[PDB]
Amino acid sequence: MKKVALITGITGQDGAYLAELLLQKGYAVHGIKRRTSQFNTARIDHLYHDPHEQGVDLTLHHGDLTDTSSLVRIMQLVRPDEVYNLGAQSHVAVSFEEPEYTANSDALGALRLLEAIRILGMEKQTRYYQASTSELYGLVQEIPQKETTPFYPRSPYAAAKLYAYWITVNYREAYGIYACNGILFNHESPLRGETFVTRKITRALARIKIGNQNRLYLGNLDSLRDWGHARDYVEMQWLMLQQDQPEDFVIATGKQYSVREFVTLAAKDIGIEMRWEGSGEAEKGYDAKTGACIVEVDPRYFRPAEVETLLGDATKAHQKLGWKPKISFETLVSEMIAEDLAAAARENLLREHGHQFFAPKE
Amino acid sequence: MKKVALITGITGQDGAYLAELLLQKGYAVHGIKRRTSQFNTARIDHLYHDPHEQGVDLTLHHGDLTDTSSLVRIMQLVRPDEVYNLGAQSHVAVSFEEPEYTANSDALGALRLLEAIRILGMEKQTRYYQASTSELYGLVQEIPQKETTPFYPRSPYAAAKLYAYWITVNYREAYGIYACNGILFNHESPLRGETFVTRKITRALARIKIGNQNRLYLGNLDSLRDWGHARDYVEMQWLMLQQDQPEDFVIATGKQYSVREFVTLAAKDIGIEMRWEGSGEAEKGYDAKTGACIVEVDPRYFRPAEVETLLGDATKAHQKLGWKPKISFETLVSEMIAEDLAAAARENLLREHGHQFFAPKE
Amino acid sequence: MKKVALITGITGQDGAYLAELLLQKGYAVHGIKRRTSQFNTARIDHLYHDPHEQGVDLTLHHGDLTDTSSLVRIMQLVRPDEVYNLGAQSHVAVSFEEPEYTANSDALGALRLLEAIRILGMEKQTRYYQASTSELYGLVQEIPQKETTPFYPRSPYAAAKLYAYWITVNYREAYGIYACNGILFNHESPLRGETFVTRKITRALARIKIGNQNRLYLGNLDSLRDWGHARDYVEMQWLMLQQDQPEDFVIATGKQYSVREFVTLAAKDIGIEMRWEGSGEAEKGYDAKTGACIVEVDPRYFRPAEVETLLGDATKAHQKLGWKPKISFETLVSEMIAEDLAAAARENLLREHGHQFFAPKE
Amino acid sequence: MKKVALITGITGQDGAYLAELLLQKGYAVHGIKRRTSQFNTARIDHLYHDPHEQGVDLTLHHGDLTDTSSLVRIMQLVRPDEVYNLGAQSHVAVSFEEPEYTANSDALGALRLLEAIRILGMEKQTRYYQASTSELYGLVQEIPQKETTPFYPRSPYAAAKLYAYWITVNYREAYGIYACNGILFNHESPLRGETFVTRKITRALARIKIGNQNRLYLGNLDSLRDWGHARDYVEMQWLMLQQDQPEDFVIATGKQYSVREFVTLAAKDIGIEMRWEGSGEAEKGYDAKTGACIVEVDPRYFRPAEVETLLGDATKAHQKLGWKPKISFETLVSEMIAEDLAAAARENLLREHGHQFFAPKE
Ligand SMILES: NC(=O)c1ccc[n+]([C@@H]2O[C@H](COP(=O)([O-])OP(=O)(O)OC[C@H]3O[C@@H](n4cnc5c(N)ncnc54)[C@H](OP(=O)(O)O)[C@@H]3O)[C@@H](O)[C@H]2O)c1
Ligand SMILES: NC(=O)c1ccc[n+]([C@@H]2O[C@H](COP(=O)([O-])OP(=O)(O)OC[C@H]3O[C@@H](n4cnc5c(N)ncnc54)[C@H](OP(=O)(O)O)[C@@H]3O)[C@@H](O)[C@H]2O)c1
Numbered sequence A, B, C, D: 001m002k003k004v005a006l007i008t009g010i011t012g013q014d015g016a017y018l019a020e021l022l023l024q025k026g027y028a029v030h031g032i033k034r035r036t037s038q039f040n041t042a043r044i045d046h047l048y049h050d051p052h053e054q055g056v057d058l059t060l061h062h063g064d065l066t067d068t069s070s071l072v073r074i075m076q077l078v079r080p081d082e083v084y085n086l087g088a089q090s091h092v093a094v095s096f097e098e099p100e101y102t103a104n105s106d107a108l109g110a111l112r113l114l115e116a117i118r119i120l121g122m123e124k125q126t127r128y129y130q131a132s133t134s135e136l137y138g139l140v141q142e143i144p145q146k147e148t149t150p151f152y153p154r155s156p157y158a159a160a161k162l163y164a165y166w167i168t169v170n171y172r173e174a175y176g177i178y179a180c181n182g183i184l185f186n187h188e189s190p191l192r193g194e195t196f197v198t199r200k201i202t203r204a205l206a207r208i209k210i211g212n213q214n215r216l217y218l219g220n221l222d223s224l225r226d227w228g229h230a231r232d233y234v235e236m237q238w239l240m241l242q243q244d245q246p247e248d249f250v251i252a253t254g255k256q257y258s259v260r261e262f263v264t265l266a267a268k269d270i271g272i273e274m275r276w277e278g279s280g281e282a283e284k285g286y287d288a289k290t291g292a293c294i295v296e297v298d299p300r301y302f303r304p305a306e307v308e309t310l311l312g313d314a315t316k317a318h319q320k321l322g323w324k325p326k327i328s329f330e331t332l333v334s335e336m337i338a339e340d341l342a343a344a345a346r347e348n349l350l351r352e353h354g355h356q357f358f359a360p361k362e
C-alpha cells in the first residue's frame, strides 16, 4: 500500500528536498513542524501547488525534538514505515551559545524517536534514518575520512550528534531495529540557511552586486570543506532505508574547497575577479578591476574550536548504493548565486513599486 | 547609564512592539531569539533601518526558554535592569498537541528567568514582567474578570501560564524581587500570528477579495473576546515595571465581540456585507449582495475544551496607571484588513512581474 | 480479571500504605521506582514477606517523573486500570532550593502520565488519581478550606502542584478521562520522611530520651496544621477511583494543631512535660521536671514564604464518600513515638554487640 | 585559603570514598545530594563522627543533574576549586529501561556543570573531573584498551558517557578550562550498589552461607572485567586534578577475571568450593562437597547488547601519575564477603532479639 514517511526538520533544507522526492515517489509524507510565531514553511509552500487538482499527500504536525510526549504522539498517530530524523539545531557556531538546547534537540531527540519506535512496538515496521554528519570527524584523524575513521568532535553540536550516531547504532545492535547513520559531508543549495558560510557568501555577493550591501565579513578563510548539493544527498537518505540490512554510509564528493575559493568562485558568477591581499585577520578580498574592497575578516565569526578540513571517502557508498554526485561544485555555486540575485531583485521590485521591505541581517 | 532591557519573545508580536517602544525611550534593548533554519526576524527587521546613522542599540542573543543554561548565560552577559518574559508557545490550540513542550516553555521558562535573577544576585537590580493572560480565567467564575477573579484554566497553555503567574507571585513574596503579572486580555495587530482567529480572518478576507482564495473555514463562531491593540498593551507592560511597588494588573478594553462579529466587521471593511444562515456546524456566512459563500464551519478548529467568553475589568489599572486604550476595535480591524490587502497585493505584483510566489497555509 | 494498579512514588509514605491496601484487595500492584545507588525500598520490603507461599503480586519498574519515555514505556508495559500519581519531590523547604527539578517532577510529571493515557488510547480503561494537597491553599483565603476555596500557592512546590491540579482537571474536562484530585491535608505515620516536622520531632524526642541526642532545633513553632494518619488517607485515594463520575475531594480531619502542640504531645508520650519560655526566635522548650533545655529555634528552618495555618472542611467527602477519620491525632503521635524509640533501640542493640552504627542527620 | 571541593554523586560508592579522602586532606567538602523520601546517606554518615569535637567540614546540598538551575545555584553558592562529576545513573542494565533519564543525567549533567563554570566566570579557578568509564570501549576495538583505543558504546549509558567524555574534551579545547576524563575501569568495594554483579554475588553468597537465601541467579557468566578497588581509584581522581595540564587517563589493574571466576573466588571465602556443570543458560554452579545448587542462569539478567570483555592498559597513568593498584583482586573479594557476612549477621541479631527486619531484594 501507500508508503508513509515521517520527516523531522521538514521545514529545513534537507527536509524540503526530501519531502519533494518522497511525494514524487508516491509517499504519504508527514512532517514534524515546530510551533512558530509566524509562517515558517517557505521552503515547502510550493509543494502544495496543485493545478491538476491531483492532490498533495503532505501533512504537517506540531511537535518538538525536546518533547517526548509530542514525538510519541506523532509517531503513534502517523504509524510511519520510514522515519527521517533531519530536525536539529544544526548550526555549529550557535551550539557554543546554546550547548544544552543543542544536546537536548540533537542528541536526546534521536533517542526519543528510537525509543518511541520501541515503546510502540514498531521495531519490525519502521526504518529509521539518523542525520549524522562529517562534523563527527572534527579534528580529523585520517585524511580522507571514511566510515572507520575515529571521531573527534570539536563543538557541542558534534558532541551531541556523536551521541545520536551511537544511540542509533545501539538500537540497531541491541534491538534489531533498522536504524542507520547517513554520515553526510557538507551539502548546500539555494535553500541553505542564510548564516551558514556558503549561503552567507552568495547572498552577500548578490546584494553587493546590486548595490544594496557594502561588504562581506567572514571568519576562517582557510577552512576546507567537501561541498555537495543537497538534492543529490537526500536521495541517498532515501536509498539507505531501502536496503536489505541497515548500514552506515559516508556520503561526500571526494573534493574539498576552501572558503576563500568559494568566495572567489561565487564572485566570478557576478563578474568580480577576486584579488586577495594580506594574511590572517588582515587578509582582504578586492575586485581586481575596480580595486573595491569586497571581503574582510571579522574574528567574531571564528569558532571557539575550529574544524579546519573535511574530505570524504565515499567508496563504500559508491560500491553498495551506486553513489555518484550528479551536481558539480561549480553548478552548485551558480545556482546559489542566481537564486540570491533573484531574491534581491524581488526586493528591489517591491521597493520600486512603493512597498517597503527591510532586509534581515545576521 | 543607559537603561538595559532583556526581552524574551522579541520576534513575536508584543516583543516587536515592545522593542520599538524601548528603543524610542533610549534603552539598550536585548532580545532572546531562537535558532531558526531561516531568518525569522521580519517583525523587527525594520528596527535596524538607520538612515541618520545614529545607531540602533538592539542586540539579539540565541537561547531557548527550555534551556536553563542559555537563559542564565544571557542574563549574566546582559545584566538587564528590566526583564520582559514575552517568549512563549502562545497558541491555545497547539497547546493541546504539545502540552509538555508548552509547559516546559511557558511555565518552567518563567521560573528559569526568575531563578537566574536569584542565583546571580540581581534581586535589587532587576525588575521582572511576566506575560500573564486572560486565559487564566478560562471557564470564567466572574463576569467581568478582575484581579481577584479566581482562575480556571481550560487548556494546557492556560495551566502552564497559571504556574508562571504563581511562581512570579511566589518569587515576589518569598524573595522581595520586583516581579509582577500583566494579566492582559486578547490584543491583536497587523503583526499577529496568522493562525490566531483575528489575523486568520483578515488574511482570508483580503485574499478572498483579491480572488486568490475561495473560502474561510472557522471553528466556534460564538466565542466572545475582549480585543485591544498590542501597541497600547505593550506600553502597560513597560509602565508596570516603573512603579514604586510590584503589583499585578488586568489590562483590557472592557468590551467583548464575537468571532462572528469580527468576520462581519472585517468583511465590511473590504466591501462585503455578511449574511449568516444556518445553525451550529451547518452555519454558513454569505455575501448578502452576491450570494457567494464566504465563511463555513469546520469542526477541526474546535478546541477540546473551549473558553467561551472573556471580558476584563481594568478598573485598578485605570486608577493606578491611567490605563485607557487609545486604539479602538474598529480601528484595529481596519488596520489589519489594510495590511493584509497590501501583503496580498505585494504577492500579485511578484507574480505579475514573472516571479513565483507560493503562499503558506495553516 | 485481576485489577492492575500503577503507583508512582511507591517507595514513599503513601505509596507503601497504598500498595499494602491494594495487595490486600487482590490487585496486581506495579510501582515506579527511581534508580538509586542503594536499596531504597525499606518502606515496602515487608510486603515481600510470604510465609504461606501464597505469592505477592508486587512489581517494581525503573522510571522517573522527569522522563516521558520511561513513563510511557511503563504505562505501555503495565496497561493499568488505575494510576496513582503519588511520586513527587514532596518537601516544601527543598522546593525553594530545587524549584525547577520540583516543577519538572511535580507539575510536568502528572502531565506526562495523563498524556501517556491519551496517546496510548487508554481513556476508557484507566482512571487517574492526582496527589493534590492542602498546600494549594497556601495563604488561606477562607477558614476552613474546602473544594471551592481559591488557591494561593506559597512555595515552588505548591505552584507546581497547582499546575498538576489543573492539568488533571483539564484532561477530565477536555478528553473525558476519569481523573480526579485528592486535595489531602497533611497526613503522617511512622513511615513519614525524617525531615518533615512531625517525624523530625518524634525522632529527636526518642533519641533525646535514650540519650543519643541533646537538643531538638525547629523553625516556626506557631505553624498550624490539620494532621491525619496516612493509613486512613490512602483508603480515600483508592475510593475516589471507584466512583461513577470523577470528582475532586478535600480529605482532612477538621481539627488543626500547632507545631508547639505536637512537641508538647509527643514529649508527653516519652514522659516529658514541656514548659515553654520566651518569644519568637528566643523561645525555648524545657523539661518541666528536670529543667533541661530540649527545644530551641533555629531560623535556618524558616521557609522563605510560610504557610501559617491549614484547616480542611471535608464535608463533601463525608457526604459523598463516607469519609470519617478512624485514627486520632493522639493515637498517631503515640504510634510515631513508639516506632522511633524502637528504631533507636535497634541501633543501641547493634552497638552493644560490637557492631558500629552511625545515625544520619538532616 | 582552604581548598573547596564539590562532589556530585557523593552518596554513591566513589563519592563516599572521595569525600573521606578529601576530608583527610583538609578540604571543605561539598556534595550534591538528591532529595530522597528517606535518609540515603548510609555510605557517608560515619564521616560526621567527631569524637574530639574537631569539626567535620562536609556540606550536603539538594540538587539534581537534570536541573540546570539547581546545579548553577550550588556552583554559585559553593564556588569550588575542584568539581568531581561522579553523579550518574550508573547502572548499565537500567539504562536500557530509562535511556532518556540516563542521557539527561549522565550526558547533559556534565555539560550543565561545565557550562556553569563558564557562565560564572570560573575557568581559571575551577578544575573539573569527569567520571568517564571503560564502558566507552564497549565492543572493544583493541585488546587491551588504552587512551587511544576508539570507542564503541554498547548501551544507552555508554552512549551518554561518550557524550560527557567529549563535551569535557571540548570545553578543555575550546575554552581552556582544566577539564579531564578519568577513564576508569570497573572498581568495586563493600559500598558497591547491591545490583552490580560483584556485590550481588558477595551479598547472595553471605546470605546463602548463613542460610537466609537459597539460590543466586546470574546472567552472562562469561563476561570478563578488569576489577580494582574503589579506594585506590578515587585517589587517582583527586590526583588527575593536581597536574600541570589537564589530560585523560585510563585507570585499570591490567588483569581481567570472568563473572564465573568471581563467584568461584567469593564462594571459596565462605567455605564453598564451586563446581560448574552445564553450558549456556543450562549452566549451573554446585557446591562440590554437598552437591547443592548454588548458582543458576536467568536470561532476564542478560543485557540487550553485551560488553563481553574489558581489559585496561594504564601504562600512561603509571608513567605520568605513578599509578599502581595497592589493593589486589583477592583482597577486594575477601573484604566484600566479610562485610556482607557482617551485615547479614546484624540482621539476624535484630531478629534474634525480637526485632523484625525484612531484607530487600532486587
Ligand atoms: N547541511 C549539511 O551540510 C549537513 C551535513 C551533515 C548533516 N546535516 C544534518 O542534517 C539535518 C538537515 O540539515 P539541514 O541543512 O536541513 O538543517 P536546517 O536547514 O538547519 O534544518 C533544521 C530543521 O530542524 C528543525 N528543528 C530545529 N530544532 C528543532 C526542534 N527542537 N524540534 C523540531 N524541529 C527542530 C528546524 O525547524 P525551523 O525551520 O523551525 O528552525 C528545521 O526544520 C540536520 O540534522 C543537520 O544537522 C547537515
Ligand atoms: N497576544 C495576546 O492577545 C496575548 C494575551 C495575553 C498574553 N499573551 C502572552 O504574551 C506573550 C506575547 O504574545 P505574542 O502575541 O507576542 O505571542 P507570539 O507572537 O506567538 O510570540 C511568541 C514569542 O516567543 C518565542 N518563543 C516561543 N517558544 C520559545 C522558546 N521555547 N524559547 C524561546 N522563545 C520562544 C517566539 O519565537 P519564534 O518567532 O521563533 O516562534 C516568539 O518570539 C506570549 O507569552 C503570550 O502567550 C498574549
Ligand SMILES: NC(=O)c1ccc[n+]([C@@H]2O[C@H](COP(=O)([O-])OP(=O)(O)OC[C@H]3O[C@@H](n4cnc5c(N)ncnc54)[C@H](OP(=O)(O)O)[C@@H]3O)[C@@H](O)[C@H]2O)c1
Pocket (backbone or CB within 6 Å): C008, C009, C010, C011, C012, C013, C014, C015, C032, C033, C034, C036, C040, C063, C064, C065, C066, C085, C086, C087, C088, C089, C090, C091, C105, C131, C132, C133, C134, C184, C185, C186, C187, C188, C193, D035, D036, D037, D038
Ligand atoms: N504526606 C502528606 O501529608 C501529603 C499531603 C498532601 C499531598 N501529599 C502528596 O502526596 C504524595 C505522597 O506523599 P508522601 O508523603 O508519600 O511523599 P514521599 O514520602 O516524599 O514520597 C515521594 C515519592 O516520590 C518518589 N519520587 C520523587 N521524585 C521522583 C521522580 N523524579 N521520579 C519518580 N519518583 C519520584 C520518591 O522516591 P524516593 O523514595 O527515591 O525518594 C517517593 O517514592 C506526594 O506527591 C505529596 O506531595 C502529601
Ligand SMILES: NC(=O)c1ccc[n+]([C@@H]2O[C@H](COP(=O)([O-])OP(=O)(O)OC[C@H]3O[C@@H](n4cnc5c(N)ncnc54)[C@H](OP(=O)(O)O)[C@@H]3O)[C@@H](O)[C@H]2O)c1
Pocket (backbone or CB within 6 Å): C035, C036, C037, C038, D008, D009, D010, D011, D012, D013, D014, D015, D032, D033, D034, D036, D040, D063, D064, D065, D066, D085, D086, D087, D088, D089, D090, D091, D105, D131, D132, D133, D134, D184, D185, D186, D187, D188, D193
Ligand atoms: N563503579 C565503577 O566501576 C565505575 C567505573 C567507571 C565509571 N564509573 C562512574 O563513576 C561514577 C561513580 O560510580 P559509583 O559506583 O559511585 O556509582 P553509584 O554508586 O551508582 O553513585 C551514583 C551517584 O550519583 C547520584 N545521582 C544519580 N542520579 C543523579 C541525579 N540525577 N542528580 C544528582 N545525583 C544523581 C546517586 O544518588 P543516590 O544515592 O540518590 O542514588 C549517587 O550518589 C558514576 O558516574 C559511574 O557511572 C563507575
Ligand SMILES: C[C@H]1O[C@H](OP(=O)(O)OP(=O)(O)OC[C@H]2O[C@@H](n3cnc4c(=O)[nH]c(N)nc43)[C@H](O)[C@@H]2O)[C@@H](O)[C@@H](O)[C@@H]1O
Pocket (backbone or CB within 6 Å): A090, A091, A092, A093, A133, A134, A135, A184, A185, A186, A195, A196, A197, A198, A200, A217, A218, A219, A220, A221, A223, A224, A225, A259, A301, A302, A303, A306, A307, A308
Ligand atoms: C557538516 C556540517 O556543516 C554545517 O556546519 P557549520 O556550521 O560548520 O558550517 P558552515 O558552512 O556555517 O561553516 C563551514 C566553515 O566555514 C567557516 N566560516 C568562515 N567564515 C564564516 C562565516 O562568516 N560564517 C560561517 N557560518 N562559517 C564561516 C567556519 O569556520 C567553518 O569551518 C552544518 O550544516 C552542520 O549541521 C553539519 O553537520
Ligand SMILES: C[C@H]1O[C@H](OP(=O)(O)OP(=O)(O)OC[C@H]2O[C@@H](n3cnc4c(=O)[nH]c(N)nc43)[C@H](O)[C@@H]2O)[C@@H](O)[C@@H](O)[C@@H]1O
Pocket (backbone or CB within 6 Å): B090, B091, B092, B093, B133, B134, B135, B184, B185, B186, B195, B196, B197, B198, B200, B217, B218, B219, B220, B221, B223, B225, B259, B301, B302, B303, B306, B307, B308
Ligand atoms: C488571551 C490569549 O489569546 C490567544 O489565545 P487563543 O488561542 O484562544 O486565541 P485565538 O484568537 O486563536 O482564538 C480565540 C477564540 O476564537 C475561536 N476560534 C473560532 N474559530 C477559530 C479558528 O479557526 N482559529 C482560531 N485560532 N480560533 C478560532 C477559538 O475557539 C477561541 O475561543 C493567544 O494570544 C494566547 O497567547 C493568549 O493568552
Ligand SMILES: C[C@H]1O[C@H](OP(=O)(O)OP(=O)(O)OC[C@H]2O[C@@H](n3cnc4c(=O)[nH]c(N)nc43)[C@H](O)[C@@H]2O)[C@@H](O)[C@@H](O)[C@@H]1O
Pocket (backbone or CB within 6 Å): C090, C091, C092, C093, C133, C134, C135, C184, C185, C186, C195, C196, C197, C198, C200, C217, C218, C219, C220, C221, C223, C224, C225, C259, C301, C302, C303, C306, C307, C308
Ligand atoms: C501538605 C503538605 O505537607 C507537607 O508539607 P511541608 O513541607 O509544609 O510539611 P512539614 O511537616 O515539613 O512542615 C509543616 C510546618 O512545620 C513548620 N516547621 C517548623 N519547624 C520545622 C522544621 O524543623 N522542619 C520542618 N520540615 N518544618 C518545620 C514548617 O514551617 C511548616 O509550616 C508535605 O507532605 C507536602 O508534600 C504536602 O503537600
Ligand SMILES: C[C@H]1O[C@H](OP(=O)(O)OP(=O)(O)OC[C@H]2O[C@@H](n3cnc4c(=O)[nH]c(N)nc43)[C@H](O)[C@@H]2O)[C@@H](O)[C@@H](O)[C@@H]1O
Pocket (backbone or CB within 6 Å): D090, D091, D092, D093, D133, D134, D135, D184, D185, D186, D195, D196, D197, D198, D200, D217, D218, D219, D220, D221, D223, D224, D225, D259, D301, D302, D303, D306, D307, D308
Ligand atoms: C565500568 C562500568 O561498570 C558498571 O557497569 P555494569 O552495569 O556493566 O556492571 P555490572 O557489575 O552490573 O556487570 C558487569 C558484567 O556482569 C554481567 N552480569 C552477569 N550476570 C549479572 C547479573 O545478574 N547482574 C549484573 N549486574 N551483571 C551481571 C553483565 O552482563 C556485565 O557484562 C557500572 O559501575 C558502570 O557505571 C561503569 O561505567
